[PDB]
């Protein structure tokens, strides 16, 4: 239980990292 739980939290934080990198890539995809 504990193991799988930590695993989940960590993977999810990974996902937050992807979303934020995507927003900041969307500010670059515009520009010129």
């Amino acid at each position: 239980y504990l193991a799988s739980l930590i695993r989940s939290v960590v993977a999810l934080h990974n996902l937050i990292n992807n979303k934020i990198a995507n927003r900041d890539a969307e500010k670059k995809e515009g520009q010129e």
């Binding site: 239980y1 799988s4 996902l15």
Partner: protein
């Protein structure tokens, strides 16, 4: 008149609503010119449609208009030949155009006989319906507006189905004041089965929702049950739609004596309604969740009653729980007596009266865990039951339903507990964990499986780029090769 509201609110508070009116025109020039056109332009009905989701927040800001002074000339920019412009103008109170002109010519009026003109026709007429009902008109301007829109969506192509989602939604809403016409039930039906063969998930779901709402506003629960079962709710659907469906299917599971599934659907529902706001929807799903847990045999958590605005609507329930958790019939009768009138404000009162089973289930399973043996004469006194005759039957029932694990000696008059398990010889804890980690783990395959998309936009960016760097290196390995034949000094 200067100095009063005949000029401070007659031309200066009207002129500001004219600046906002004339800004809204510029906004629907981006909702229609850029985005409704983009639907067919190069995506065939995709992301430019979710920019027409904006049709939610635009009625609140349609108070910048009065189905405005510039409108007669605005629906006439959008088209050349139209019989909706010939209904829409009858239903305007008074257009009195000014010297403003939207970006349309006699050339952008010829070019607007488009398959995008049904999207605009419905899109704007929807606005006519919104205001028509706000101002408390209905009857002719209701029906006619709607039915012309029901002739619009009869047309072909798969992009109009989506905007027809919103169409249907308002259609039912206005149809629902005067008297929720069951006539529409057939239209919905007919348009639903059609949508199942066109495989328009969106329209299929939305429509299916307003249908379920029809069966539920009356007492046709059996008719919704057999339906919910026999039919397949689409896979792609906007979340709002999925929250509706998960509140209704749960309502149904609840009434037919199945609190099991309900408490698990109910909850998923609460957690899909939009976060920041959703006031009413959340405010009601609570009034039901709170009772499905009680009915199920579990206490609801306290945080459901410590919430900003919707704490004023739950206050009666709070005193239902005061009585249910404690375990005695007396307080349950008193509380469901004072506030019964309000519980009868919805169709919940049918579920509530059932709790008399559970206040005694808990009162008695509580006595079992408080005591080791006690006399029936006292069991009747703590439970506010009937006789010592009634008690023995009640307890007995509990036993046969493995909800108390005890025994009775009747020739002496006492119930006796057999409790002496240390929970760990049970599987129980291992079953509970087998539950936890399946849930938990599912979140871990799931959120990587959706994390997949951010990496995909980057792969859309080159990952073989800087070929001139590699070619420069290759031109350095021909100078390096011979640099080492010249450090060897050997041919």
């Amino acid at each position: 008149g200067g100095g009063s509201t005949g000029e401070a609110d007659g031309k200066t508070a009207a002129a500001a609503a004219e600046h906002s009116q004339r800004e809204l025109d510029t906004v629907t020039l981006e909702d229609i010119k850029e985005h409704v056109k983009q639907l067919e332009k190069a995506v065939s009905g995709k992301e430019p449609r979710f920019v027409l989701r904006a049709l939610r927040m635009l009625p609140s800001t349609s108070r910048r208009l009065n189905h405005y002074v510039l409108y007669k000339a605005v629906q006439g920019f959008f088209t050349s030949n139209n019989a909706t412009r010939d209904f829409l103008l009858p239903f305007l109170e008074e257009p009195m155009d000014t010297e403003a002109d939207l970006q349309f010519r006699p050339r952008t009026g010829k070019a607007a006989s488009t398959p995008l003109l049904p999207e605009v026709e419905a899109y704007l007429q929807l606005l006519v319906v919104i205001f028509m009902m706000n101002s408390k008109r209905y009857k002719e301007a209701q029906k006619i507006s709607d039915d012309l829109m029901q002739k619009i969506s009869t047309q072909n192509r798969r992009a109009l189905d989506l905007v027809a989602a919103k169409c249907y939604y308002y259609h039912a809403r206005v149809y629902e004041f005067l008297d929720k016409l069951d006539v529409v039930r057939s239209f919905l039906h007919a348009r639903l089965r059609t949508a199942t063969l066109r495989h328009d998930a969106d329209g299929q779901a939305t429509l299916l929702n307003l249908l379920l709402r029809n069966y539920l506003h009356y007492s046709l629960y059996d008719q919704a049950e057999k339906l919910v079962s026999k039919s397949v709710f689409p896979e792609q659907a906007n979340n709002n739609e999925w929250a509706r469906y998960l509140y209704y299917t749960g309502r149904i599971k609840a009434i037919q004596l199945e609190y099991s599934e309900a408490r698990r659907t109910m909850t998923n529902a609460l957690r899909k309604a939009p976060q920041h706001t959703a006031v009413g929807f959340k405010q009601t799903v609570h009034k039901l969740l709170i009772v499905v847990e009680l009915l199920l045999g579990e206490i609801p958590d306290r945080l459901q009653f410590r919430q900003p605005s919707l704490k004023r609507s739950l206050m009666p329930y709070f005193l239902l729980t005061q009585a249910v958790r404690t375990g005695n019939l007396a307080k349950f009768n008193q509380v469901l007596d004072q506030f019964g009138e309000k519980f009868q404000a919805d169709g919940t009162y049918t579920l509530i009266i059932r709790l008399r089973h559970n206040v005694i289930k808990t009162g008695v399973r509580m006595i079992s865990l408080s005591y080791s043996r006690i006399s029936l004469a006292d069991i009747a006194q703590k439970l506010q039951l009937d006789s010592p005759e009634d008690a023995e039957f009640i307890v007995a029932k509990a036993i046969r339903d493995g909800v108390i694990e005890a025994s009775i000696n009747h020739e002496k008059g006492y119930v006796q507990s057999k409790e002496m398990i240390d929970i760990y010889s049970t599987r129980e804890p291992q079953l509970a964990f087998h539950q936890r980690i399946s849930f938990c783990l599912d979140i871990h395959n799931m959120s990587v499986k959706a994390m997949r998309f951010p990496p995909k936009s980057y792969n859309k960016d080159l990952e073989s780029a800087e070929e001139r760097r590699e070619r420069e290196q290759q031109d350095l390995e021909f100078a390096k090769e011979m640099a080492e034949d010249d450090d060897d000094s050997f041919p």
